[PDB]
């Protein structure tokens, strides 16, 4: 029998997440199922509403499946905060499987309302400005810089930028407006909104451990999954999980390269930080840690155990 599925999404159609991630996903899904299970794509939140309610739509059943950045929705998914702490990512290869086994053990509770497909992430984010070459921490100071979630946008303060938080298709025109002087972004996600175009500066961190990343959350409505036939759960199943998230975390390592070679092509520059102005944001970063780990203690998590936990598993997928 045939089954409908709503997903819905805030990207645009063209950006990685739809055209390159969801889309080839439901056709796979729609192959194996015989053409029964379809998935309905709404880009560019088509179904209504604002990016941190995705999660509350696909919760309650408003649609079936979406796509968001987990923290959209501040506190809301305590345990995947420990992958946002500075310095803390390696490939998103490496850290998307980490960040799967961690969903499927320590951090399950975060996500016990939903049927996980995958939890993941992109490569390592990078620091992009209008003009302003970023060596080292001190030429943030007064900079104004957008970052996605609260963890990240405290990684900046304590760069000694002035943070903002927003979901990125704000972005741009918060660029535009003079609300940012700036952002940190992976490279992958800044066609899709023209801010290859609006920012020329770019920087990025050299060594094993790249600047940031943050999870994103590939889910389905639980009451949904539950009703499925057992044929079209294997098809969904065979199609989540630990091989969805490393599958995806290739896919945003490839997602950058096409991405960089559009910003340069534009007339950016990418300036690599090493030495005394790594290791200087290096420093810092190791506080911002600090400062989680009493913060997960006193949400009643042990922040160092997952801590810990978070940096082993992403050392056992650095393969
Ligand atoms: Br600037
Ligand atoms: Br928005
Ligand atoms: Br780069």
Redesign the pocket.
Known sequence: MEVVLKFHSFPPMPANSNAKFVKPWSEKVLAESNGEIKVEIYPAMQLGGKPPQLVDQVRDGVVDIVWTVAGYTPGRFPHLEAFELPFMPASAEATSQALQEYVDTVAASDLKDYKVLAVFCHAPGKIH????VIKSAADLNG?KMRGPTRVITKMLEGLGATPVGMPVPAVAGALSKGVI??MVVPWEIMPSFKLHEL?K?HTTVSGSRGLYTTPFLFLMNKAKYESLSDEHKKVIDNNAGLALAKLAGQLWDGFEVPARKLALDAGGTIHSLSGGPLAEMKAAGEGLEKDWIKSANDRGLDGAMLVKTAKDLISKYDK
């Open positions: 400005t209008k003009e302003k900079m002087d700036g920012t500066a």
